[PDB]
Structure formats: structure tokens, C-alpha cells
Amino acid sequence: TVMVNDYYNRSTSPWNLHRNEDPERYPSVIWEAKCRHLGCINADGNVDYHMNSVPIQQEILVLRREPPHSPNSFRLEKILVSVGCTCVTPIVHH
Amino acid sequence: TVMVNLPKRSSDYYNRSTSPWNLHRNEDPERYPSVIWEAKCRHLGCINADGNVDYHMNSVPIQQEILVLRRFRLEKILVSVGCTCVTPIVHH
Ligand SMILES: Clc1ncc(NCc2ccccc2)cc1-c1cccc2ncccc12
Ligand SMILES: Clc1ncc(NCc2ccccc2)cc1-c1cccc2ncccc12
């Protein structure tokens, strides 16, 4: 316990941004990515299913009000967020 | 003033991507967490169907704003989490 005071439009695996809001959380608003397509954009600008768009996830630190509905008392929490998309081969080498 | 009660690589996307990336160690002993693993794109370009680097396309890092604790105050920093492939800006 302590005291405390456009490029994605040009991607071959493009995404949209989605508002993730939670007043019981700091930061209250987190911008999450959702891939537009299951395939990737090929050279003619069409979705190609020989490759797949996949979201990249990241574990983010967050402050959660503890106990519920407290203006100045928080607990440190980790959550998983989608930060963007990449284009991958659908097969795995494992 | 508020009261606060107090790295791995588990996905294979980094290697399966047309914009693959490596991880670099970002360490700060007066910070929580002290170690963060940041992505860096492997190539300037992206991998084509033949397995070769296409220098016309661009590999670019995906950044995310994250919360860290510094010796105790709260700070927001930007971190690279992966890379995507984009078509370049080719007009004014
Ligand atoms: Cl410009 C382009 N070039 C290649 C690809 N995918 C193929 C590829 C990926 C990696 C390495 C080699 C080749 C896609 C696009 C592309 C992206 C976004 C919008 C587009 N709108 C119209 C036309 C193309 C678009
Ligand atoms: Cl399998 C493959 N297929 C297509 C691409 N990029 C072209 C493309 C992108 C988007 C839409 C259409 C076409 C790249 C790869 C590829 C990716 C990763 C490693 C590889 N290692 C060897 C050979 C290919 C590899």
C-alpha cells in the first residue's frame, strides 16, 4: 500500500477504435482495437483469406476503486486489452 | 492524493506476421513494473508471399499508453506492443 497523487487506416490488417469506459477504473477510458476483417487486404484492396488479421493483446495495469465506489482508495489490477491488429499466416509452426 | 493497494511472450504472432518484430528490454529500477518488453519491427518493409522483404510497404510499431508507478507517483508512458504492415503515404 502506498499513496499516489491514422496509420491503422493504411494497414493490411486494419482496425477500428472502440471506447472502453468504466467509472470504477483509472484510467476510466481505454481505446481498444477491433480488427475490421478476418482476412488481410491484398494488393488490389480486397480482403484475402490466405492470410488473417489478428488483434495484438497486452496486459495493462489499472486502478480499480476498492472498496466499490470509493473516491480515493484503489487496488492495483491487470487487464487484457486489444491494442491493434497485425497480418499473420493462418498456420502455426508448433 | 489517493491510496493504492499493490514479462512474458506467450503469442507467436511476432514470428507469423508480415511485419514481424523482436522484443527489447526496457528496465527502470525506480519504476513499477521495473522491466517492460517493448517491440521493435524487424524490417523496414513487410514480408511478401515469396518470403522476401518488400521495401515499398512499411512495418510500423503499434503503440499503447500505459500506467506506471514511479518512486510514489503515477505516470503515463507510450510502449510499442507489436508491428503492423501499412501502405505508405505516397501523395502530398
Ligand atoms: Cl498497397 C497494398 N499493397 C499490398 C497489400 N497487401 C499485399 C502485400 C502485403 C505485404 C507485402 C507485400 C504485399 C495491400 C495494399 C493495400 C493496403 C491498404 C489499402 C489498399 N487499398 C487498395 C489497394 C491496396 C491496399
Ligand atoms: Cl505466407 C505469406 N503470404 C503472404 C505474405 N504477404 C503477402 C500478402 C499479405 C496480405 C495479403 C495478401 C498477401 C506473407 C507471407 C509470409 C508471412 C510470414 C512469413 C513468411 N515466410 C515465408 C513466406 C511467406 C511468409
Residues in chain A with CB shorter than 8 Å from the CB of B84 are: 7-8, 11-13, 84-87
H-helix or E-strand spanning residue B14 = helix B13-16
Ligand in nearest proximity to the CA of B46: 1
Instruction: Give the resolution to one decimal, in Å.
Output: 1.9
Cα A63 to Cα A5, A34, A60: the distances in Å are 13, 24, 10
CA–chain centroid gap for B19, Å, is: 12
CA–chain centroid gap for B85, Å, is: 13
- Give pairs for A26-29: CB < 8 Å, separation 24+: A26/A62, A26/A63, A26/A74, A26/B67, A27/A62, A27/B67
**Residue A72 and residue B4: Cβ atoms within 8 Å?**
no
Rama region for A82: left / alpha / beta (φ>0; ψ in -120 to 50; rest): beta
Q: How far apart are CA A43 and CA B56, in angstroms?
A: 12
Rama region for A41: left / alpha / beta (φ>0; ψ in -120 to 50; rest): beta
Mutation test residue for ligand 2: of A48, A89, A91, the one with most atoms within 8 Å of CB: A89
- Name the residue with cell 481498444: A32
Three cell numbers written together for A74: 484503489
Radius of gyration for chain B, computed over Cα atoms and rounded to the nearest angstrom: 17
Query: In chain B, what are the domains?
Result: 13-86 (2.10.90.10)
- Name the residue with cell 493504492: B4
Q: How was this structure determined?
A: X-ray
Pairing assessment for the beta strands A25-26 and B35-41 based on DSSP bridges: unpaired
**Closest atom of ligand 1 relative to the A48 alpha carbon:** 6
